[PDB]
Design a protein around this ligand. Structure first.
Ligand SMILES: [Mg+2]
Ligand SMILES: [Mg+2]
Ligand SMILES: [Mg+2]
Ligand SMILES: [Mg+2]
Ligand SMILES: [Mg+2]
Ligand SMILES: [Mg+2]
Ligand SMILES: [Mg+2]
Ligand SMILES: [Mg+2]
Ligand SMILES: [Mg+2]
Ligand SMILES: [Mg+2]
Ligand SMILES: [Mg+2]
Ligand SMILES: [Mg+2]
Ligand SMILES: [Mg+2]
Ligand SMILES: [Mg+2]
Ligand SMILES: [Mg+2]
Ligand SMILES: [Mg+2]
Ligand SMILES: [Mg+2]
Ligand SMILES: [Mg+2]
Ligand SMILES: [Mg+2]
Ligand SMILES: [Mg+2]
Ligand SMILES: [Mg+2]
Ligand SMILES: [Mg+2]
Ligand SMILES: [Mg+2]
Ligand SMILES: [Mg+2]
Ligand SMILES: [Mg+2]
Ligand SMILES: [Mg+2]
Ligand SMILES: [Mg+2]
Ligand SMILES: [Mg+2]
Ligand SMILES: [Mg+2]
Lengths: 145, 205, 116, 60
RNA sequence: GACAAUGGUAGGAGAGCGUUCUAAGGGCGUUGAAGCAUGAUCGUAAGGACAUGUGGAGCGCUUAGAAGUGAGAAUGCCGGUG
RNA sequence: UAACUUGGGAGUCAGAACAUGGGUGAUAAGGUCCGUGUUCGAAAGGGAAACAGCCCAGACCACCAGCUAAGGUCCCAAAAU
RNA sequence: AGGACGACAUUAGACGAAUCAUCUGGAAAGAUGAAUCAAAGAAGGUAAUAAUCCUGUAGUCGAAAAUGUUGUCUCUCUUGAGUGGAUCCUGAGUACGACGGAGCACGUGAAAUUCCGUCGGAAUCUGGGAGGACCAUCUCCUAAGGCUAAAUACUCUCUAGUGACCGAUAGUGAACCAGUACCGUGAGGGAAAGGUGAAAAGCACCCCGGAAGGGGAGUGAAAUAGAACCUGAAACCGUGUGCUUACAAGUAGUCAGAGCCCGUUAAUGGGUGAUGGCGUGCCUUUUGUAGAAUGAACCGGCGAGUUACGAUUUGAUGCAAGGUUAAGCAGUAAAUGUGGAGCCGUAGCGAAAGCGAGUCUGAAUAGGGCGUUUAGUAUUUGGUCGUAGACCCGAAACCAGGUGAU
């Protein structure tokens, strides 16, 4: 609080050990390396994943696949998140952003259904899922896919 | 929840406008990563040494090798000579990290609530004087009594209050949008105008 | 902030040299060899404080057995009879009786001899 | 400089916790036993992800 | 009051003293500061004091930071003396 | 009184002598190579004259206290001529 | 495309406010008391530590002259909009292609775009190209001729500043008449070396000595501060001394303990030691060392896990199905205001289309693998990885560019 008696957080400042500064620290004369060999030399260290001449794990396993050039990533809003608002007017790619639900939808905002609609709501989405399109027409409401 | 107002020697009408910013129990460990931040940010880290590379000379190999009977010494400017070369000097770097924007206000609403919730705060009404008179302000600090460390705050500017009180040891004159966190706990006594006091809750809460 | 070893050293080595006085020759005047000799002198000090308990109850066994056979009793038959006499005394006392004041020890040898 | 993954990770897919290889010994000889040719599905990698979890870090 | 446990290398895990600088608070200093020498004192260790000489001007103590932070060995480097 | 599952940090991949089951060697080695135990390595004390590996036994520090283990009891040197 | 008419900035410098008295002291700026300015309590000097003693600072002014920004006018200059498009021109050995090759992140491969070499080589507005070979359709734009400010990269210097940067083995190699002595034929290497005091007051004179030095006297607070000059530690070489040593076998001690001498940070006191037990230094390296294995002549000083950027982990602290800013722009080189481009998370499965609380292989709703039931996120103290020289010190050796046949 005041300057002349400020106390730190409660188990947050630990001081770092200087290694190789005396035989009575637990890191004496050799500072954690060992005695000789590859690791104990200065700057030595094997590349990660190198079994010593034996070919590594990522040469035996074969490769497969290719990604895409157009892999349209729908921002998957679940159906449970709609159970917060009211009046049932619309849901909208101009509104469903700015109620904080979705952000940076790549292309299309699909309604996957894993919650409960619980309201006679009216949507206007991009494209649908099969089971969740039953839930909107369950309690009553159209759209524009 | 009702701070009493004085004007220049006289009691007057006061306000209650201290609700959320003035009154939170002070979260101290939030402050310790804010008082440490600013004072490890004021200073320009500019300090270097020349390591084994950039010193002058050293292409010679002085002894040869086998035969002479000295060490296996390599150059003239290796570190263990009395010449230069320092293996682990200070690299010129920068000392600057940051807290998130919610923590960055929660320290500041905890700093001045350390003042109001226990031992010390005063709100005065505004005061103007055109000619810069230092003596006409050291007069004022001893009527409504404060100790040596004292902080005055104008609402956005002062052509005189920023330019008086700049000679006295222990006084800082800070515009209300320049409210940092070291001085507000370095001081012991907030004396603010009544025009900025309504603004600091309208800008921190 | 460069910091060099300003007198964390010569205020440290002159509590080894000053702690090592009276050694022969050039092992009381200079650090690098006289640090070794004090460093053994503790290693002896831990060792031989387990010899004063192995030497003084080797002294008292002599000066009891020198005084036990001044009364036709060997040492081995003595403390067998003394333990059967129910005498829970040490040896250091049984020394210090038998060298200052014989007339106490003159009948103490009887009681052990009379239990047998 | 940023940690540079190496592109032997065209051969592994992050499942939700563990890796996923594709089982070796695919082509170039099928003078080999018939119920062992039926083993062509994929397995998750073992606990030698200790030796490689600084190599495949940005596939996430 | 018990009750058990405490050899120890490579190595893993905690608690600690000291050196230089800054920030804040609080002090000692020509009625003699820092270093230097001497002493039978205090703490479980690293270490902390206090008198007395020499010394002629800038230092501690608590809290908290940042590191060019600790010496006995490298046929180490430099300067002295055998 | 341990065990196992997960997650950070390693070190070792130059072993040796005894006691026994074996190959090689010549029922040769303080040899080499496996099994299986102990101790040393990483363990100071007491005995084996001295002596890393054999025999007793595991040192948190103090004391001028007592019993005992392995080995001993005429003298050097504690204890039975 | 040149040049007269007229406001600032540089290159010197002015003014610039507020105090005394006592005490110890060689001397006060210190202590104690009594005052005063303050747009001036930055900084240094003065016989010690000064807001008020000096030089200064805040704030104000000045410029014969000569340059740089430049505002104004004066001058040069200068017609710009529409329609018809029935004809005429739009950058030739060019674009392209074949052949070897370089660049494009792209190693000639499925290889567009781009320039060079050799050789063949077009059409022109119904044209001509380009949308990762090529053809078709659709959108975009007109090569083979030129010119161009600002955002941005640098300091051998110049001006004014700042520093949890060093204080003479550090800092530049170089505080000191430094790239100098000095070594080399040469190209090129490349050091050491700071401090009297406040002021020179730098020892008049007397004495021994040829002088150098020295003892008195003398200056000075101090010459035990004497021009090798503040402070003066260790190795090491010396001077009289209290205890002790010439029948003795020794990694130099330690634990017992006699006799004689001294009296303390006054405590179960300090130094010396006739005689007994006990006993083969230290570090590296080893299956193992007193080792006849290595390393150290001794004493000082210097000398080895560091930083930036990331990744993953526990410990901390905000917020909660939500958390979060980058560059920039304002601002005591203030760490605080704005900036929601982005990143991560709330849903996975499969190579992919696509499907979704479940998909995938599959003829199957059969059986399986991976999921579902919710905690992630931002910054930071630790431990460890990666890229950088990345714990220090050491090689023969390679490739450029030069100097040498005395
Ligand atoms: Mg260890
Ligand atoms: Mg060592
Ligand atoms: Mg190793
Ligand atoms: Mg080593
Ligand atoms: Mg090895
Ligand atoms: Mg290297
Ligand atoms: Mg040192
Ligand atoms: Mg232990
Ligand atoms: Mg550790
Ligand atoms: Mg100092
Ligand atoms: Mg040395
Ligand atoms: Mg030599
Ligand atoms: Mg044999
Ligand atoms: Mg065996
Ligand atoms: Mg063991
Ligand atoms: Mg023996
Ligand atoms: Mg003997
Ligand atoms: Mg003046
Ligand atoms: Mg003045
Ligand atoms: Mg080609
Ligand atoms: Mg010096
Ligand atoms: Mg010179
Ligand atoms: Mg005088
Ligand atoms: Mg001396
Ligand atoms: Mg002998
Ligand atoms: Mg070993
Ligand atoms: Mg020898
Ligand atoms: Mg040698
Ligand atoms: Mg010739």
């Amino acid at each position: 609080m005041k300057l002349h008696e400020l106390k730190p957080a409660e188990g947050s400042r630990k001081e770092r050990n200087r290694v190789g500064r005396g035989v009575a620290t637990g890191n004496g004369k050799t500072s954690g390396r060992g005695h000789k060999g590859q690791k104990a030399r200065s700057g030595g260290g094997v590349r990660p994943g190198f079994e010593g001449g034996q070919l590594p794990l990522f040469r035996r396993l074969p490769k497969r696949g290719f990604t895409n050039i157009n892999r349209k990533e729908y921002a998957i809003v679940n159906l449970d998140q709609l159970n917060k608002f009211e009046d049932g007017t619309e849901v909208t790619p101009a509104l469903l952003v700015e109620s904080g639900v979705v952000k940076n939808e790549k292309s299309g905002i699909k309604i996957l259904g894993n919650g409960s609609l619980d309201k006679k709501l009216t949507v206007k989405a991009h494209k649908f899922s099969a089971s969740a399109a039953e839930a909107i027409d369950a309690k009553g409401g159209a759209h524009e896919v | 929840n009702y701070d009493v107002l004085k004007l220049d020697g006289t009691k007057s009408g006061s306000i209650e406008l201290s609700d959320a910013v003035f009154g939170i129990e002070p979260n101290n460990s939030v402050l310790f990563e804010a008082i440490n931040l600013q004072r490890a940010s004021l200073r320009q880290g500019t300090h270097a040494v020349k390591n084994r590379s950039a010193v002058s000379g050293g292409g010679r190999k002085p002894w040869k090798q086998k035969g002479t009977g000295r060490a296996r010494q390599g150059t003239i400017r290796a570190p263990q000579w009395r010449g230069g070369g320092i293996v682990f000097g200070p690299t010129p770097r920068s000392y600057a990290y940051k807290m998130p924007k919610k923590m960055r206000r929660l320290a500041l609403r905890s700093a001045l609530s350390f003042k109001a919730q226990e031992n010390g705060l005063t709100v005065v009404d505004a005061f103007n004087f055109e000619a810069p008179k230092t003596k006409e302000f050291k007069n004022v600090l001893s009527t409504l009594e404060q100790p040596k460390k004292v902080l005055v705050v104008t609402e956005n500017e002062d052509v005189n209050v920023e330019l008086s009180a700049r000679n006295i040891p222990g006084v800082q004159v800070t515009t209300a949008q320049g409210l940092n966190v070291l001085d507000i706990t370095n001081a012991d006594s907030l004396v603010i105008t009544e025009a900025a006091a309504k603004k600091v809750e309208e800008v921190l809460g | 902030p460069r910091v060099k070893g300003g007198t964390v050293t010569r205020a440290r080595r002159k509590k080894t040299i000053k702690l090592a006085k009276g050694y022969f020759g050039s092992k009381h005047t200079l650090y690098k060899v006289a640090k070794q000799q004090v460093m053994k002198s503790g290693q002896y000090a831990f060792r031989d404080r387990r010899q004063r308990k192995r030497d003084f109850r080797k002294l008292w066994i002599t000066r009891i057995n020198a005084a036990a056979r001044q009364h036709e009793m060997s040492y081995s038959r003595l403390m067998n009879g003394l333990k059967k006499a129910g005498i829970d005394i040490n040896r250091k006392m049984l020394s210090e009786i038998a060298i200052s004041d014989e007339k106490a020890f003159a009948q103490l040898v009887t009681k052990a001899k009379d239990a047998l | 400089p940023k940690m540079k993954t190496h592109r032997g990770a065209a051969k592994r897919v992050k499942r939700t916790a563990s890796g996923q290889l594709k089982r070796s010994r695919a082509f170039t000889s099928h003078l080999f036993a018939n119920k062992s040719t039926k083993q062509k599905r994929q397995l998750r990698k073992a606990r030698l992800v200790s030796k490689s979890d600084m190599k495949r870090v940005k596939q996430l």
